[PDB]
């Protein structure tokens, strides 16, 4: 078997070059990243003969046919950007985007840096925890859960761990799709990933579809209207057709996170789709105490320090600056040459934050 794989190049590799190249290139033309055909006469029924390049575009007439598995030959049959007639059932859905979407069922995150966010948790208790726990209560209430929940606050703070904190109490599926790869103007990139989210959400009830940085997606941008691309043009339709149009509410929920509401299409901003807006505020002294005691387990600290004092001397600060206090405390300990962080080490770390921020 070891020497068997070596001599197959003299036998098997002869047909593989003809069947994998010559058969695909026949007529001056499985994952498909490219498809084309040139001067092909077939037959009306599964004829294809479509050039996916913007040069020399082709269509298909004579009725309508649906062949989602194999249209004619497979292979060089494709769609890519522009829709042509009956070619829709075979889209090129292959893409190494698996590093973008992160699917986590029932996250175990409760409070890490979100300590003191219970004010925002109560905002997410009625519109998220309630429909994902006892959805039958809305039949007696008569109202409806919001189709979507919008997140707002300081950039890069409170829009990450706060979404997974409510997902634990709901025992739901948290699917985070980073909008950074959807920034592309490539035709069909945005509408394809959004459509697949609602398909997997119909299989398992009580799931949470999260869109990271909706400002990177939005309902409209400069390359949508001014450009000839349908990117984000058909993507908003997937949110209108699936979420509000057909798919239920308590079973399939959608959550957005933005740095400002004015960057979203008012069509999605109007009530009926995006209703509640969650704003991240500054935690209180009780919130800072619960976060410091959790970080004190990972970092070496003195057994005699008291966080009820130094944290009180610091005013209300963002959750990102609270992790900085624990990291900067060890920096002064290295200068002081101590295996742990004494009470004087945390004092110099807070004063460094007060003098450089004043928030």
């Amino acid at each position: 078997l070891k020497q068997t794989e070596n001599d197959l190049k003299d036998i098997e590799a002869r047909i593989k070059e003809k069947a994998g190249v010559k058969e695909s290139d026949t007529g001056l033309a499985h994952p498909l990243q490219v498809a084309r055909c040139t001067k092909i006469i077939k037959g009306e029924d599964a004829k294809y003969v479509i050039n996916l390049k913007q040069i020399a575009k082709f269509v298909v007439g004579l009725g309508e046919r649906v062949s989602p598995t194999d249209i004619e030959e497979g292979m060089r049959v494709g769609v890519d950007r522009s829709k042509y007639n009956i070619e829709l059932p075979l889209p090129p859905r292959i893409d190494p985007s698996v590093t973008m979407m992160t699917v986590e069922e029932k996250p175990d995150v409760t409070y890490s840096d979100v300590g003191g966010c219970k004010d925002q948790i109560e905002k997410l208790r009625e519109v998220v925890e309630l429909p994902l726990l006892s959805p039958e209560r809305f039949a007696t209430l008569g109202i409806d859960p919001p189709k979507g929940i919008l997140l707002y606050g300081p950039p890069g703070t409170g829009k990450t761990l706060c979404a997974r904190a409510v997902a634990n109490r709901t025992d739901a599926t948290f699917i985070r799709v980073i909008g950074s790869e959807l920034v592309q103007k490539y035709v069909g990139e945005g509408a394809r990933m959004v459509r697949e989210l609602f398909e997997m959400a119909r299989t398992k009830k009580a799931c949470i579809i999260f869109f990271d940085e909706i400002d990177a997606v939005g309902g409209a941008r400069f390359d949508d209207g001014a450009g000839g691309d349908n990117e984000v043009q058909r993507t908003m339709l997937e949110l209108i057709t699936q979420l509000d149009g057909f798919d239920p509410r308590g079973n399939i929920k959608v959550m957005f996170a933005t740095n400002r509401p004015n960057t979203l299409d008012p069509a999605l901003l109007r009530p009926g789709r995006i209703d509640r807006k969650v704003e991240f505020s500054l935690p209180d002294l009780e919130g800072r105490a619960n976060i410091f005691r959790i970080h004190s387990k990972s970092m070496s600290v003195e057994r005699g320090i008291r966080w009820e004092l130094i944290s009180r001397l610091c005013p209300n600060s963002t959750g990102a600056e609270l992790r900085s206090v624990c990291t900067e405390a060890g920096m002064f300990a290295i200068r002081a040459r101590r295996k742990v962080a004494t009470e004087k080490d945390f004092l110099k770390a807070v004063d460094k934050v007060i003098s450089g921020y004043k928030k």
Partner: protein, 363 residues
């Protein structure tokens, strides 16, 4: 030559069976490209820079685990079949790529900056040269460092001096090259910076002179751009996703941090803010000692004589002032500056340069 003839030469000469014909049957020509997708069915998609994108097959050379999409591989010209795999460094990443080895600057040549040396050392050199100090404390060392100053002194001497002691390759990325004025080049070029330093990590990322991506403003006008807003967000995800013991650092220096995105700031990732300070008289004594080792000075003039008159010069113009001090001696036809030359040379320097006068005559 003698060893290779009696060792490596008979290895290839005695036994020739395979590895010679592997590059034959598939094809002789070579056209470099990038793998779009890899599967177990022995078929893939390759695209050359000339865009002859086709659908071809695969023959067994390296296992499918070694083949990854997004890297340059060994291909064929006409049939475009995969004949092997190559190194990914041939893929263009950033328009301006500068890799410098063995930087010349060090802590001894930058003068009296030891006040700022301990700051840049703790956030860069200390976790690299002492990873156990941050590990026992259970904390993560700061990856980023904020610097203030002028190019050639503040934003230059501090960056190159650390790479010498850390024994890391100097990697410079121009701040304006992060934004190519094309949508999608922002997140693409930022991920490729951490990719070169993400294998063996024998380097440190350096970025200097950012007048552009540091300020996105509110819009695509007034110096900002819309592509900057979404680029600084992906750099945050690449900063938090990047995890090591500190072998690679990201050092960016700009004029003002007030226009930066609070997301990319991310307190606790960047714990270091180094503001340019006015050095004292002891700084000049360290810069003079370097050049006075070559240029000979008179016995009546010591390091305390030249440091007497110093007006708002840190480290840069001490060499420029000594340049005129050696140029005036050429007029007197002598190779050794003596006491008569020091007096006439320093007067031509300190005078007739700064027109604005900061003076206490407001009364």
């Amino acid at each position: 030559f003698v060893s290779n003839s009696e060792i490596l030469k008979p290895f290839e000469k005695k036994q020739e069976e395979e590895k010679k014909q592997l590059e034959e049957i598939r094809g002789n020509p070579l056209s470099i490209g990038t793998l779009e997708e890899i599967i177990d069915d022995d078929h893939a998609i390759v695209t050359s820079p000339t865009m002859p994108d086709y659908y071809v097959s695969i023959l067994s050379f390296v296992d499918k685990e070694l083949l990854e999409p997004g890297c340059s591989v060994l291909l064929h010209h006409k049939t475009m079949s995969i004949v092997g795999v190559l190194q990914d460094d041939a893929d263009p990443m950033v328009s301006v790529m500068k890799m410098d080895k063995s930087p010349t600057e060090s802590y001894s040549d930058i003068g009296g900056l030891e006040s700022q040396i301990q700051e840049i050392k703790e956030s860069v050199e200390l976790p690299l040269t002492h990873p156990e100090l941050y590990e026992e404390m259970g904390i993560k060392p700061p990856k980023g460092v904020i610097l203030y100053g002028a190019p050639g002194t503040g934003k230059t001497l501090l960056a190159k001096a650390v790479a010498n002691q850390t024994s890391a390759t100097f990697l410079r990325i121009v701040g304006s090259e992060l934004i190519q004025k094309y949508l999608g080049d922002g997140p693409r070029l930022c991920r490729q910076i951490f990719k070169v330093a993400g294998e063996n990590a024998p380097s440190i990322v350096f970025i200097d002179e950012i007048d552009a991506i540091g300020t996105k403003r509110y819009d695509s006008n007034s110096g900002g751009e819309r592509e900057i807003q979404r680029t600084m967000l992906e750099l945050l995800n690449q900063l938090d996703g990047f995890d090591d013991r500190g072998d690679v650092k990201v050092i960016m220096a700009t004029n003002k941090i007030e226009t930066l995105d609070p997301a990319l700031i991310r307190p606790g990732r960047i714990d270091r803010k180094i503001l340019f300070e006015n050095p004292d008289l002891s700084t000049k004594k360290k810069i003079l000692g370097i050049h006075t080792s070559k240029m000979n000075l008179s016995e009546d003039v010591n390091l305390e004589t030249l440091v007497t008159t110093k007006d708002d010069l840190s480290g840069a113009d001490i060499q420029a002032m000594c340049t005129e001090a050696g140029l005036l001696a050429l007029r007197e036809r002598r190779m050794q500056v003596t006491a008569e030359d020091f007096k006439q040379a320093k007067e031509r320097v300190m005078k007739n340069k700064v027109e604005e006068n900061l003076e206490g005559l407001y009364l």
